[PDB]
């Protein structure tokens, strides 16, 4: 009955508002309306902030109070002045101006700031150099140009004297402004040159007796012009090169702070906090919005294959160069990445080996080395020496695959059950892929742009354009941008190229768009380090011991996944929270689900 | 009502062929604020130096507005304030101590030599720009020397002593019943908003950065009082707005205003502060994303006046003001600077471009939809409906100016 | 300069051009081009305000005054000529060197004006003290716990946010700016003490985005009273507001209400200030339903006229429903009366109500 809701409206309201401290304010607001202090429309507007989401409830409340939908909007900035203060006079205000202009209402910073002041936008260390240079530019430019405008003013004067008779010369005083348009300019220039105060009786002499003063003042002003210009030219070289060293850094707000923010936000912790944050959102609303609990909190997509041969050859370079990993073990690190990738992403291994082989060219027998063999050292030497019961399906959601009755016969869909140190190794793999791919998507536009840019003829005849990178070769003039970015990165891990020179080359080549490729040397390192954990940590290796068998299985029953899941759970401690990485072969779609089940 | 859309190349509209009038007073470059002050009136001279070398003087009509009198300056500012401006000089600062506190002059807005003359160049420059539009002589007026939108009735704020825009608008208001003012400087145009807040004859649509950024006014709820309720429109943007997002906000709002409140004239204050790299402003607008604002307002076909306003990095603002002067003359300029006296400034590629930075765009489409929704809710209420006056004397400056700016040096 | 006006001018002065211009000397070349080249007695605080400003200093004693504070105020343009003394020093000089015992001087004053006698000493004393700025005596400010005197003598309340340390505003690394969290700080989307995520109230989500894609992240701030996190999008809000005053979240009761009477145009209600704990009197009325709280309430779980009425929650349900049902009856009455009224203004009704069914 309609009575049923009303006798429970406060109960329904109490549940949604949640914490009592917010419910009390909801009661206080409801009080003010019943005390006739608060108008009905104001009550409904305030209740909106409480019960806005529950549309079925808020609509009922709006129905109950009788709210009907379809000045005092003063604003916070402006305050009214009294009538008396508006009388301070204006000489030239027409009758029209009085109606239009505003005199009563006023607003000031000291009131809008709440007297606590403002925050100015922070600027770089380098962007504050272009500001020091700008002022040094203006200071020389202001004095010289203000000096020229006097030169022309006096030059037309001086020629007039030599036309006039000497007797005439006696009486040719100049009104102030020397007849020029500006009365003030010619004073600030003479006062600067002629010693401050002494300069004042020059101007009086210039007016009272110009015939003998103007020729002398013009002479010196030209002489001071020549000295000032000779300095600027010498100062032009200092300013031009300094602007060249620190310009492209000034634009780069995110690139400078990236190297320190990468190691802070790419860690085992935040990669789990990030994925968990999406899981709680889908379940929180379940509490309030009633969202169903879905699979695959995190979704990735892999549109381009050739990035995988690009990442592998990058990590191939680092592994060989690295001094930390012992030489016999490095062969497993190289052979882990090729096999794991060739297994997870369906890429044929032989295709990968040619890609590495060609990259080796740029600079004797293969039995079947399973990834299962790689994960155990004992079996590795042999291929180195050679050339649960009564457990029904209850969850349903965890194992995505309920496709077919009994046993699914041919499924593209494949899920990898993972520890923390497997998922992190996989997030370090996508992180490179996301950073690399967005470069290759720009590669067609950027490659054309780099070639077609042309030197201005007025800057090539003179020696103005920076030639530092062209000598070093770090300008993508001769090659496509993306393939060049790789063979620059390959030099970064090799140590041949200094870091500040690698970065600056991508600043001019990509206009600062590609700032994420500043830690391609370190992210590659961390990926290798995590991949090393997979061979060691024999608990974790046993997980991918099961995965390889499952990924090789074409026909997996629904219960088989549960068998696969439960065995994997046995190897983790009851505290650790396993992940589910799910792969769709047809659509190269990888979806990660966050699991913290029993 | 905010639909994110990628930026499109600026295209010139052949339908409109406006005959521009350019106001350049050669002296306005020779005034300097201080030893380290951000406002540098040099930027007008370079922005004019670039213009003459593109040969834009072949299309425009060069004018030198007669400087504003002491009386005409008072039709907005109180007689006490203007009288203080005339006498005040750096040597006279000791004599004036009560005034210098009462009138916020000489501490952040310094008392530089020639304070009165420079202000007198700004106003006659905008005022006459309105006077020529009224007579029908020009469909556009370009007064980069002026545009100082921060000054108040009896106070000098934000580097702006004489608020010329109010002087300019009052001149338009004598012929056009309704005038629209559009602000694209990163700061809130409090000088013009506070002057026209009560009247409905002027709508002051201002885009700015809110969040305790000077002057810390212009919140979304400020919509005027009295008759001028809903006739004020503030769009408080957040940090790091960029080319594509700015267009998706500027164009829909302006298109709504010129439909519901049909203006007879527009005063568009092309602020330089919004551009990327400026020392005091925090947006990520590039030239193409900034000059597109001018091209949109021009396309409507109603007489407008373009005022320079504030620009704090001489290199960037001089480039965009030259490009905007190109669009008004129906010519898209080539991305190759021509030789000019101030050539060493525009490093390092020496091209006419202001390069957008890398900073993180924070305005979010969920936020921008809520701001643009409230504005459209309000705008549905704004349905349409020695004195010299109409100072007209202009001076025909180009004969004198052609040898300036145009360089065959080698 | 000097010159036989008929003859040539003697050159003014050799220009001592050592300007120390922002560049080192305007005429001087750049120096060494090492970087930038790729190849190679009276107090200083007003005795009245206790603050700074332009002062007018007493001559006898080390006490300085503003130009406005001293009574009567003195124009900065026009000042008394010669030496000046504070009203205290003028008193001592006044007393001293004439009828010197104060008593006799004061004994004449009390005898002079016998009507005001009860105030006689207070009037005489006021001629000796220097001008002062009014400050509320401590026994008033101590009554209200919330209020406290600021650095400048300001009224500072519980609403005013405690000032940021000057180091925090201007001394930060470039990547992280404390004042504005506009650089993708993800540790905002975490509760420091408990470790759970902060969840917005409007959308019941936290939008912490990946480090791969930070544009999926939406900014979140927390109330200063409630501590209920809100997106900067849900409450439309331009920025964090960490300077001016504490940000009152929506969802917190009003402390000041402007009610239009709909017939002065308006009535104002302000919540009673919080009194000191001991002087406060909490009262639970005997009447459950319909007590006039006047807006001051403490929610019971289930001359001091400043008494906070204590109301049961079940009472608010009855009050709110009582108000609603009465208005609905009145609204139905007026509508029904008006329809009946047009019948009242009405030989034959011809209302066609019989046809209606």
């Amino acid at each position: 009955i309609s009575l049923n809701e009303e006798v429970t409206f406060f109960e329904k309201a109490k549940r949604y508002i949640g914490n009592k401290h917010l419910y009390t304010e909801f009661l206080k607001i409801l009080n003010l309306y019943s005390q006739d202090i608060l108008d009905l429309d104001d009550l409904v507007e305030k209740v909106d902030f409480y019960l806005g989401s529950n549309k079925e409830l808020f609509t009922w409340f709006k129905n109950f109070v009788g709210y009907q939908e379809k000045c005092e909007a003063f604003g916070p900035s402006y305050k009214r002045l009294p009538k008396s203060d508006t009388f301070m006079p204006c000489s030239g205000r027409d009758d029209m101006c009085w109606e239009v202009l505003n005199d009563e209402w006023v607003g000031h910073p000291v009131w809008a700031s709440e007297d606590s002041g403002f925050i100015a936008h922070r600027k770089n260390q380098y962007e504050e150099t272009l500001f020091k240079i700008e002022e040094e530019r203006h200071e020389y430019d202001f004095y010289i140009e203000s000096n020229l405008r006097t030169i022309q003013c006096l030059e037309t004067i001086v020629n007039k004297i030599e036309n006039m008779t000497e007797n005439e010369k006696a009486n040719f005083k100049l009104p102030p402004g020397l007849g020029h348009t500006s009365m003030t300019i010619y004073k600030k220039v003479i006062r600067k040159v002629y010693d401050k105060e002494r300069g004042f009786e020059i101007i009086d002499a210039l007016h009272e007796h110009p015939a003998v003063t103007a020729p002398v003042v013009l002479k010196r002003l030209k002489q001071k012009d020549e000295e000032w210009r000779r300095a600027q030219r010498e100062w032009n070289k200092v300013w031009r090169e300094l602007e060249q060293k620190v310009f492209f850094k000034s634009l780069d707000h995110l690139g400078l702070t990236f190297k320190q923010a990468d190691k802070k936000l790419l860690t085992t912790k935040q990669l789990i906090s990030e994925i968990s944050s999406i899981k709680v959102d889908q379940t929180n609303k379940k509490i309030h919005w009633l969202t169903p609990k879905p699979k695959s909190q995190l979704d990735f997509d892999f549109p381009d294959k050739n990035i995988f041969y690009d990442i592998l050859c990058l990590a191939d370079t680092f592994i060989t160069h690295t001094t930390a990993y012992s030489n016999p073990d490095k062969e497993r690190l190289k052979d882990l990445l090729k096999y794991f990738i060739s297994l997870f992403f369906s890429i044929s291994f032989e295709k990968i080996e040619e890609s590495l082989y060609s990259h080796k060219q740029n600079v004797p027998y293969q039995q079947e080395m399973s990834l299962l063999d790689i994960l155990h050292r004992s079996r590795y030497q042999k291929l180195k020496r050679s050339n649960e019961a009564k457990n029904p399906w209850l969850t349903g959601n965890l194992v995505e695959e309920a496709n077919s009755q009994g046993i699914i016969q041919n499924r593209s869909i494949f899920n990898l059950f993972a520890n923390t140190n497997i998922y992190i190794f996989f997030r370090h793999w996508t992180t490179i892929y996301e950073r690399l791919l967005e470069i290759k998507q720009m590669n067609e536009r950027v490659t054309k742009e780099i070639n077609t840019r042309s030197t201005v003829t007025f800057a090539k005849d003179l020696d103005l354009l920076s030639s530092q990178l062209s000598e070093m070769g770090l300008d993508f003039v001769g090659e496509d941008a993306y393939k060049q970015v790789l063979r620059l990165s390959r030099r970064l891990i090799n140590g041949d190229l200094e870091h500040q020179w690698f970065e600056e080359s991508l600043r001019q080549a990509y206009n600062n768009k590609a700032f994420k490729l500043y830690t391609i040397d370190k992210v590659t390192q961390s990926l290798v380090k995590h991949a090393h954990t997979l061979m060691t940590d024999a608990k974790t290796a046993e997980i991918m011991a099961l995965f390889v068998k499952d990924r090789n299985a074409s026909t997996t029953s629904a219960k088989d996944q549960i068998i696969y899941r439960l065995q994997v759970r046995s190897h983790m401690s009851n505290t650790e929270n396993m992940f589910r990485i799910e792969f769709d072969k047809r659509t190269l779609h990888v979806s990660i689900q966050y699991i913290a089940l029993d | 009502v905010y639909e994110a859309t990628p930026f499109d190349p600026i295209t010139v509209k052949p339908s409109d062929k406006r005959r521009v009038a350019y106001f350049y007073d050669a002296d306005v470059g020779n005034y300097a604020y201080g030893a380290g002050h951000p406002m540098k009136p040099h930027r007008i001279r370079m922005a004019h130096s670039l213009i003459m070398n593109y040969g834009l003087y072949k299309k425009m009509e060069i004018y030198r507005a007669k400087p504003a009198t002491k009386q005409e300056m008072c039709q907005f500012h109180t007689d006490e304030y203007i009288d203080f401006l005339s006498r005040v000089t750096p040597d006279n600062l000791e004599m004036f101590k009560r005034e210098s506190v009462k009138f916020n002059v000489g501490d952040d807005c310094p008392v530089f030599d020639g304070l009165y003359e420079y202000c007198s160049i700004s106003g006659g420059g905008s005022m006459e720009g309105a006077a020529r539009l009224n007579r029908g002589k020009c469909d556009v007026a370009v007064n980069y020397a002026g545009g100082l939108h921060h000054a108040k009735k009896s106070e000098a704020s934000g580097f702006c002593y004489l608020n010329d825009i109010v002087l300019g608008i009052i001149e338009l208001l004598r012929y056009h019943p309704r005038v629209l003012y559009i602000d694209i400087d990163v700061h809130h145009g409090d000088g013009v908003e506070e002057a026209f807040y009560t009247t409905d004859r002027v709508m002051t649509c201002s885009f700015h950065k809110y969040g305790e950024f000077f002057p810390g006014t212009g919140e979304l709820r400020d919509i005027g009082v009295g008759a001028g309720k809903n006739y004020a429109v503030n769009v408080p943007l957040r940090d790091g707005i960029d080319d594509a997002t700015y267009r998706s906000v500027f164009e829909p709002v302006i298109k709504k205003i010129m439909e519901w409140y049909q203006p007879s004239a527009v005063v568009l204050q092309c602020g330089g502060d919004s551009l990327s790299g400026d020392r005091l402003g925090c947006f990520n607008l590039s030239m193409e994303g900034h000059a597109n604002c001018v091209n949109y307002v021009k396309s409507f076909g109603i007489p407008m006046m373009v005022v320079g306003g504030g620009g704090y990095t001489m290199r960037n603002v001089a480039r965009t003001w030259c490009f905007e002067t190109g669009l008004l003359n129906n010519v898209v300029l080539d991305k190759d600077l021509p030789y000019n006296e101030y050539y060493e400034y525009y490093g390092p590629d020496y091209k006419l471009s202001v390069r957008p930075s890398n900073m993180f765009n924070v305005n979010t489409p969920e936020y921008l939809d809520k701001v643009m929704t409230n504005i459209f809710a309000n705008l549905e209420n704004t349905k349409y409906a020695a004195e010299d006056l109409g100072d007209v004397e202009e001076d025909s400056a180009e004969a004198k100016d052609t040898k300036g700016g145009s360089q065959y040096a080698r | 300069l000097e010159k036989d006006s008929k003859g040539n001018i003697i050159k003014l002065n050799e220009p001592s051009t050592i300007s120390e211009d922002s560049k080192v000397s305007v005429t001087g070349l750049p120096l060494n081009k090492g970087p930038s080249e790729k190849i190679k007695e009276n107090e200083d605080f007003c005795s009245a305000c206790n603050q700074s400003g332009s002062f007018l200093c007493c001559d006898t004693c080390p006490k300085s005054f503003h130009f406005l504070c001293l009574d009567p105020p003195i124009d900065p343009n026009n000042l008394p000529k010669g030496d000046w003394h504070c009203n205290e020093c003028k008193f001592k000089i006044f007393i001293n060197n004439s009828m010197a015992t104060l008593k006799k001087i004061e004994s004449n004053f009390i005898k002079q004006n016998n009507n005001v006698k009860i105030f006689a000493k207070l009037l005489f004393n006021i001629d000796s003290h220097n001008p002062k700025q009014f400050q509320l005596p401590n026994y008033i400010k101590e009554t209200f716990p919330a209020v406290k005197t600021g650095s400048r003598g300001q009224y500072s309340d519980e609403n005013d946010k405690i000032p940021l340390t000057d180091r925090q505003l201007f001394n930060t690394s470039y990547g992280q700016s404390i004042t504005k969290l506009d650089s993708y700080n993800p540790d905002t989307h975490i509760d420091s003490n408990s470790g759970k995520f902060l969840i917005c109230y409007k959308c019941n989500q936290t939008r912490l985005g990946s480090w791969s894609h930070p544009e999926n992240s939406r900014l979140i701030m927390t109330c200063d009273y409630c501590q209920t996190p809100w997106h900067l999008d849900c409450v439309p809000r331009a920025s964090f507001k960490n300077l001016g005053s504490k940000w009152k979240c929506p969802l917190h009761s009003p402390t000041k209400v402007y009610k239009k009477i709909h017939h002065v145009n308006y009535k104002v209600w302000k919540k009673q200030r919080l009194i000191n704990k001991k002087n406060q009197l909490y009262y639970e009325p005997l009447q459950k339903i319909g007590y006039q709280n006047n807006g001051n309430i403490q929610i019971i779980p289930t001359n001091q006229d400043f008494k906070i009425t204590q109301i049961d929650e079940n009472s608010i349900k009855y009050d709110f429903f009582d108000k609603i049902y009465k208005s609905k009856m009145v609204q139905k009455r007026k509508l029904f009366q008006f329809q009946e009224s047009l019948i009242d203004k009405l030989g034959s009704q011809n209302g066609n109500s019989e046809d209606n069914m």
């Binding site: 910073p109 | 506190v101 916020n104 | 009276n42 200083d44 400003g53 002062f55 007018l56 200093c57």
Partner: peptide, 24 residues
Amino acid sequence: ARTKQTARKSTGGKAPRKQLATKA
């Protein structure tokens, strides 16, 4: 009489005025 001086000439203290004398 001798009057010291005021060091700074504004009521805002330049905390609310840009290019502050006292706020950068």
